[PDB]
Every structure is written in structure tokens, then in C-alpha cells.
Design a binder for this molecule. Sequence first.
Ligand SMILES: [Cl-]
Ligand SMILES: [Mg+2]
Ligand SMILES: [Mg+2]
Lengths: 663, 663
Amino acid sequence: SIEQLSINTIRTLSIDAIEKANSGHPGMPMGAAPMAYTLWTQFMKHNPNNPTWFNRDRFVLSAGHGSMLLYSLLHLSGYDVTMDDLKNFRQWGSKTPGHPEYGHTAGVDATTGPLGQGIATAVGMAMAERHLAAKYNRDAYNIVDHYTYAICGDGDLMEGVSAEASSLAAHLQLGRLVVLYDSNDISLDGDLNRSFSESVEDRYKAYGWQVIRVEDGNDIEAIAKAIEEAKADEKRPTLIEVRTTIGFGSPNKSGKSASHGSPLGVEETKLTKEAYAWTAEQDFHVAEEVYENFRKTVQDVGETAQAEWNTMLGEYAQAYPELANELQAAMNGLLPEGWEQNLPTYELGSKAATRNSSGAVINAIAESVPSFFGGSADLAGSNKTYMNNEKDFTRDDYSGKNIWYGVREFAMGAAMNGIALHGGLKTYGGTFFVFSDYLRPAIRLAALMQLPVTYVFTHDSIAVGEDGPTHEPIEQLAALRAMPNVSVIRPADGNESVAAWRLALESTNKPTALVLTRQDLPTLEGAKDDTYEKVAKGAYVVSASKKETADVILLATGSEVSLAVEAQKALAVDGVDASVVSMPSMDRFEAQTAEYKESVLPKAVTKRFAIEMGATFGWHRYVGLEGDVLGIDTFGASAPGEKIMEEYGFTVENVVRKVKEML
Amino acid sequence: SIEQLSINTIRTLSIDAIEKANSGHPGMPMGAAPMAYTLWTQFMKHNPNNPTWFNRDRFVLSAGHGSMLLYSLLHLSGYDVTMDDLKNFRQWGSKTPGHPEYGHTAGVDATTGPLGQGIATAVGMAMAERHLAAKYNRDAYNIVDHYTYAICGDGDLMEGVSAEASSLAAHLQLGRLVVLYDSNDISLDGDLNRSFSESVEDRYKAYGWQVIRVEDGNDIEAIAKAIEEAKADEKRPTLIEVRTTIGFGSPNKSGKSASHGSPLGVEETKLTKEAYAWTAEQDFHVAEEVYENFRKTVQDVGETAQAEWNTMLGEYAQAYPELANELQAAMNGLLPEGWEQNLPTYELGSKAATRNSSGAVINAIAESVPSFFGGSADLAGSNKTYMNNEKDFTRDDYSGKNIWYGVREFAMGAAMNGIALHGGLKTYGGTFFVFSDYLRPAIRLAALMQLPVTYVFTHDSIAVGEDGPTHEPIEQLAALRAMPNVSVIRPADGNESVAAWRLALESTNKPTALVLTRQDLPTLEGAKDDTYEKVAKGAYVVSASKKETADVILLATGSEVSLAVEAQKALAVDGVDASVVSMPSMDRFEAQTAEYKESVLPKAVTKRFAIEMGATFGWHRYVGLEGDVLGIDTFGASAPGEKIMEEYGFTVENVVRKVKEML
Ligand SMILES: [Cl-]
Ligand SMILES: [Mg+2]
Ligand SMILES: [Mg+2]
């Protein structure tokens, strides 16, 4: 009956916070408060005074809309989420935003809301945990050893991304992933049965998960049994279908979707509190006995767990000083001193496809940077992402560094977020640039969360050639350039692409999309010296005009810079004096100083011509009303890459003509 | 037998076309030839001489890299794909591009290539078939009565979109969808089991599909029985797992991912032709009897079938003339005369949220345009997409026009494509604008295929308020505006709204995204008269500068136009004379004459200020180097919408101030 009291406090806090905000989702906090309370207080190892503890159990509220459930538990458990925080649910500047936000609220492990992704993120977190354990754990010292938990709803399990991530998690046999499914026959919009009649249990057994059913979500002893069972089966990831009733306790709107997405309201709140034998007559009431219960079951237990872990760690250090030092540095995102010495250089006269350049870099990194971990969505041979002297990450060897994601772009993107969130690893994921659209929503969460993951997007243009328009990117550059807090770098040759990789690996608070070619690019002279400082500025002058004042500026990126440089000679002959600007990254250029920008794009020179095999959208920021751009505003074609390029106008002859045309 | 010879003509035609192109995917045509031959030859009714026949069985090559298999079949059975076309596989301008392209090659029902989507598009075609039968069907007369077939591979079933579509196809008990699964233990990059170990069969049963397995994929007999078996169970969809060996016949690369996506090579194709007992010495050899075998099994069968169907149609028109007439108009994409007569109007001084505005138009269209069919990804309540005077589309009533997609944005997008492809129906689908990201690859295929589907994207800005940054679009406008052949319309009020919908329904060759507000917008004096004509222009002067040439032009779209027109009056008080341009749609504006454009945005007026709650990316096309934009280049926040709007600078006083600063 104290557990019951605690459960009803969670319920009642949630409801009251939502009444006060006059916004929010009360229904599932009420249905799910029991299973959540049981997991949080009886199974999870976590320290409310140190939410950042490396070996804490991880937790993901995949069903984001139920955020008050998480906020309640955090507050009641002694995390730094106060009563005044709860009373500011969904308000400007809150620590209690409408959906959970990693980095903004103490104890929130991931940002959820977009449905399905929380589960896939958790799958990434569980990958990181076994990978780190294999790398770092030794005799006695189970230094990395924890579980990964999530709570989801019906929506989550309809989304393809959760389907992909579950297939994957089963294949890697991630036995410490445990997902609690709030199964209540209601969706965002009405009865589940309006969209949904599949057998979740049977699908998950088919993947290869353990599934365990709980008939009565209000039965704590049963949920507790299922989790015990979940945790003893280290072989399979486990799903626990917990049968609950949405808005439990609301007489009028319990059974209904009406209870899902808006405050139950003053009269119905009173009635609900009745139904709970909730006598407390002030809102936001929590009994001393309830705090005490959480202090006993969560705070004291996590405290002790953490203290022992720290003692183990100190012993681990003496017994394995260099190993423990490496781990320390990895947990802190520090790259080893001098790691970049390893990297390729491309000599004047060489030719390299930037996907190949990227592969050579990836191999030099795997050798010099112990925290590197990544793979491809089933395109390893085409993306060049494979670490040739590293093992595969598998159910049989969690220490392998090469991940085989299969044809699961979206789950890949979301797992990468989970890998980064965990800490202790630098990750990357490869697919064809044209398929970046498949994982777009995960990129956006990586941007929101400030996660420094790296995407290896190859086959970046119509130069892809025979595969045709469904495989040729056109608008993909603009679609990422417009997104807040993503860096997009499209290197113009081998050396720019080594600098690009350094910038991606060095990132701490934003994802980096590397945009790479299928086809060979000529090593540029203007790029060879101080490439890193050049690429770091985002745009620099790769080939100066003759006078301090150019007749025209050619701007180009990636594979079009070489083109721009030939055009430049061709124009010199005809008495036109061009400078060439290489712009491997618009976002980095934009962050530079008014004085630096002005030194690369002189305001008095209005004659500017951008060249890029992609949408023209975005280029007028640089070329203005009086400049022009050679880009591509239609889809591509199926033909040898160089034939499309010629037909689409990417030839010196055409650039010279279009340029002479506008001055 | 003549079957085996016909089957190996498919094989060799495919091999040699790839040899000659020196590019392509030999592996699957080799392994899948038997199964595809059996389906095409012994089950599908289709008339090579009329690929457009409304009641043919539809076919989707979801595993699009296997295009030579489809092209071989089309040629051999007498569709307008000639031998020379085959000899120009993957060549510039040819009718045989590397992945199938709808509208480019006779008898290709859908564009495929991006994996997984083919299946989800098939699901939509099957949804159209059934809906259309229930609407238009009658006694004796089976006007709409056909099947939907696809062929997919391992990759397709790892993709989340095929999971979502399959779940939904099961829910709807689309009994006339049969997917042939080329199951060969080889994915794109190596052994299937490096990434994949799930039970596909058990998963599909779990959803509610029928799974028939064919143990030996060379057994025409066994495959044929499976298909019969699929066609008497009109209760659920069927998945037939056909076990094949990729690159069957190849000695050094059969069974290996090596046969997947490169030409066999000149001497390895020698050995393979050896293994088929293929003796011909010229390259693209088709023996006379093979042609005839196809003429008997496909052409003759197809013509008789179409003739019989044509007569039944004759009887139908005599027996239900007004109905028959309706069907005819639908199949020809014709909107009824005066359909737009009951279209809502908003009087000066009124208010309307464009999602409600849109809701009103949707209901008015369901009344007056009988080919309408659409729904929401579980957000009918919030998107306002529901037709309140229409029934729901269900396994028990396909006459229902209201579709319930569930939480499956991607599958809904691809299904809509399948619906538009079928013919007979005008579709739309709704979700939060922030989640357009989820169905992006399907929007791209819609743009590619020139399908006039309509997206209802509501909740378009940080005005969404409390739900927070994961739910507040920023970059979604730019991301769509950059893509070729998509129209994007962001109505500035209720009237601009109604016009947008008309332009959308009137579309015939491009998807239209409607970008709609959760919050009320004030009806605009300048938009009130000739709304349709103004919006059709893309951008127009919504309230004039007092004077010949303005001091400044204010550009705005959607919910920002009113802020702009208010800025314009505060600016007037202060001595600055501004005109206000509403741009509901940048793409429509760009298509206007140079002279129309000059009238809205005179090249003389260089002081131009853009205002929009979304990335600033792209605006410089209009405001140039000398102008400015007030937009949002960070993520949003969790707070009342009003409050986020003020904090992010969207107030009269801040607009007036930033304009003065650029004067
Ligand atoms: Cl749900
Ligand atoms: Mg639910
Ligand atoms: Mg395969």
C-alpha cells in the first residue's frame, strides 16, 4: 500500500502538472505509472545524485508524450528536478519541456517524441554497452556492465524504424535491452483496432526476442516477475507487453483516446482523485512517506552501487593503468595526442574518389583512435567504410569494431544516436547520399541533441551514372544545409577530405555529414597546403585571381572545384580574370568573421558564379541577384556518369560561356 | 521444354544486356527468372498491346536493381520495348534505364529502386483496386477486379517501410496482393546472415499474411501451385518465399554477393551460357518459338481478356449510365464541372486556422468530387483530414473514403503513390509537417513519377508551442522547396488556403504539399478578391506601397503575411513606404513570366526584407545580397506558441526595427 501510494502520487503529480500547463498528455502516465514505478524502484540501478554515472542503467521513454511520467519519477527520486520545475511543465525556459530533452533535464538519457525512434536509440545504447564491456572488461573488473531499458506505446511499434531496430537487436542478441510496452488498445487518434490488428508478440518472437505478457498492468508483482525473467535471459533482447488501461481512474474518459492528449480538466480531475482515494486537498501534493520510499529504493541503492563501482574502478586502474587511462580519455571524448599523424596525404598530381580517400582515413583512424566504432547500411563495399584490420561486431565478439547494419538506414541513424549518447565511443554510419532521406528524422534528433556522429554519404551526384535518377542526389545538399546544427562538408579532393574527417572526428556538439564522390577527383594545388585550416574556414580562395580585384568569382564545392579551376584558365585566355573559391562547408563559412568572409567574397565584387551538381536552392546567399549558378533543378538520368555531366552542362566550355554571358 | 528455354532466354538476354552496358545487376535476374516467368506467363492478365488497360493485374518490381528481368519479360511478350532498347540498357536516352521508371517505359507500372518502397506502393495499388470495386461495382458487372503483384528481395524486407505497409495490408486484409520474395541468403554486401537472422515467414504470419514457401526456386510447378494458393485466399495478402540461388548458372560467383551488382564478365558469361546448355553464338538471341510461346501465353490471353472486359463495360454503361460516366471521368483524371462551387469563403475581419480552413475544403471536396480518397497517419483529429460525411475504409467496407494509416508516415506516403498510379482516385494524406521527414523518400518518388498526390501538412511552425522542438518544423519548407517537381504552398489565410487546395486538386503532374497552421490567421484584405488567381501566381502584391517605387518590399508566406502587413503600417507612420508580397508558393512564382515577376519584385527596389518562421535558407534568391530575412535557424522550444514567437523576434516592433536597420 505504500507502493500503491507512490504510484498514485506519480499519477496525480502528472495530472496536476498538465492541468496547470493546460497542455499535455495525462492518459499514459496514468496507465503506465505502475510498470514504470516497478522498473524504476525495483530493477534499475541509477544514482539520482549522479545522473551521468557511466555504468548506470540507461533508460529511454520512447513514448515521449508521456513525459510527466518521467518528470514525476525524476523528482520523487531525488534527481535535480524540483517541485517548481514540475509546476512549470511545458513553459518557456522549463527544465520540464513537453517531450523529454537530453541535455536540458537532469537524468534524461535521450530526447524522444517522434515515435519509434526511442526504441532504436535504446538499441544503439545497448550496442555501445556490449562493445565497451568487451573492449574494457577484464578478470574481476566488470567495469562496463549495465542494462538498457525503454518504455514504448502502440505508435512506437507501428513505426518502421522500431521494426528495423528490433530485427537488428535480435541479430546482435542484445540480451540487456529490455523494453516495456504499454499495450492499451488506444492510439493517438482512436481505438488501436482502426489501424492495427497484428500480433506484436509473434512478430518479436519471429525477430528472435523473448516476449513476456502481463495481463494486468496494475499488478506490480507480475511486472516485477517479467523483468526478473527478462534479465535472466542474457541471450535475447526482451519485450514485455504490459496490458494497461489508458487514463486509468478517469470514470468518464479512462477507456478512451480522449484521455491521451489534453488535460482531463478540473471537474474530471476531482473525480479521478476521488477514484484514487486521493484525499490530499492541495495540488502537487506528495507525502513524506512517498519521498522516503524512493530515497530507500532508488537513492540509497544507487549511492551504494555507485560507490562500489568507483572502488572497483580504482583497483582496475592499478591493475591495468594504460587500459584504464584509455577508457578515461574515451569517456571524456578526448582523441589521443598526435592521432592525426597517421592520416593520408595526396601528392600533387594524384587522383582520388573522395569515398576512397574516406576509406583510407577510416583505416588510419581505426589504427590511431581506440574509441572508433561504425559501419554501413549494407553498402560497406560501395561506401568504403570497412575497417580492414578490425573484426566484425557480432553476437559472438562484441569487441569487433565493424558494424553491419543491413538495409536499415533509419535504424542505423537512430542507433548511432544511442551509441553517442552512451559515451566512450566515436561513431560513424555509411549509406548512399541519395538514401540520407531514409534516416532524416534521426539526423534531426542528432542535431537537436548535439551528438557528434559522422555520416559517410557517398555517391553524391548525377556522376553516379547508370543507376539513374532514383540513385542520384539533387536536393540532398540543400535539405541538410537548411537544418539547424548539422555540419555538411563536401570535400573537393583527397586532402580536403582528410581535413573534413578531422573536423568530423573532432566535433563535440554537432553531427557532421561527409558528402563523398563515386568518381576520382584531381588533387588540387590550391588545397594541398594547410588543408585543415582551409577546410576549417568552410570557404577559402583555392585559386586566386591575378589582381587583388577579380573580374569574377567562381564558387564551387566538392567535385565541381576542379571544373571551376579549369574554367579559370580557360577564361584567363579570353581576358577574364576569375578567382576560385572552394566551399567545402557553408555552415563553417557562415560562422567565420565579417572580416574573413569579406576576404573571400569581397562585397564590391558582385559578379559571382557558383557551380555545383545539385539544386541551386541556397546559392543566392552568395551569388546574389546579379550573380548566377550552374546547378541542377531536375532529376538525373540513367547513363554513364560523364555523359550526364556533359548533357547537364558541367563542362568547361559551358561554364566559360555562362560566365562570359553575365559580365 | 519451351518453358526452360524461355526462362533461360530471360537469363541470357539479362546477362548480355549487362555485359554490353558494362553496368548492372545480373544476380537476381539469374536466380529469379523461373519465378517471374511463371507469374507473368501463367497468372497475370495483361495486354502487352495496351499496357494502360485499367483492369490489368498491376506488377511492381520492388527489387528494382533487377530491371533486366523486367525489361526481358516486357520485350519477349510483345510490349513496346524492342531489342535495340535492350541493347541500350543504362544508356543515355534509352527506354531501359538502370532501375524501372514509370512513364518512361511501356508496361512499367511503378518506378522502383529505393528498397522497401516497391512493396509499400503495391499495397496502395491494392487499396485503390478494392476501394474502386466497392464504389463502382454492381450486379454481374465486375468492372474493377484485378490483382496486385510484386517481386522483392532480402533488402526490401529489412526496410521499415515494407514492415509498416505489410502491417497495414494485413489489417486491411488486402487479399489481392501477392508478393513474390526472392529469398537467396544474399543481401547487397555479403552473406545475409552478417546482418540478418530473423524469421520472415513468422513475421508475416504475425502481421496476418499467408506465407507459402517454395523450397526450390527453379520449380515452375511448385511456384505455380503457390500462386493458385494465394489467389483463393481472398481474405489475406500472400507472401511467397521462393528459395533461389543468386547468379544461378554462374560457376565462380553463383551464391555470392559478387553476382549481385556487377557484370559477370566476358569469360564468366561464357561458362554460364555453358551451364544453361545455351548454344547460340550471337549475343542477344531469342529463338522464334520463345516469341510465340509468349504470344500464346501473354498477348493472345491478354487481348481476349481485354475484349471481354471491354464488352462488360459496354453493358455497364447502358445499365448504369451516370455511374459509368463517373467512372470514365475518374479514370481520365477529370474533375466535375463546377466542383469548386461549394468551396468555403472567409469574409473580411474573420479568423481561421489553415488546418481548419483545409478541413472545410476537404469536406466540401468529398461532397462534390467523387474520386476523392484520403486520410491521416493517426492524426485525423489534429490534421483535420477527416471527411465527416463519409464512411471508413476497412476490411468490412471498402466503399469507405476515410483511410486510417496508423503511425506509418512512410508507408502512407508510398501507398498514396500506389493509389495515384492505379488511376480512378484523387488522394491526399496528412501528418504533422515536422514528420514530413518520415515520408521524404516517398515524396521524392512522387516527384519523380509526376504523381499529383496531395500532402496535408499541419502544425507548420514554432507556433505549435508546448509540444516542443521535436514537434516544431524549422527546415522542412526549405527541404521540400529544394526538391525538383514538388509544389509547396503555404497559404497566408483561409482564402489563400482554399485556392491552395484547388491548385493541389487541379494538379496532374506533380505532388503538392500544403503547409498549414495550427493557429488562427486573420483574413487578409489584399488576399480576399481573386484569391485563386493571385495564389496561382505563386507570389503577388498583397498590399501596395503608396508610391510608385517602394522604399522597401516585405516578403512573407503563410502566418507571417499578416505580421508583415502590420509592419507595413507601423513603417508608414515612421516615413518608410513598403509594399507587402505574399508568396504562398515559390515554385509557382518562378514559373511566371519575367514581366509578371518584375511587377511583384521590381529589379529597381533592392531593399527587400523577408519574414518567415522557418530556416532562412533559400530566401536570398529574392532578397539578394543587400536585403535581409527574419527567419529561424535554431530549433524551437517548449512554451506557449505566442511566447516562442515573441522570443524568436516575430513581433511588429522587431520587424520594424530590423527593416529600419537595413535601410
Ligand atoms: Cl500509442
Ligand atoms: Mg496507446
Ligand atoms: Mg537477395
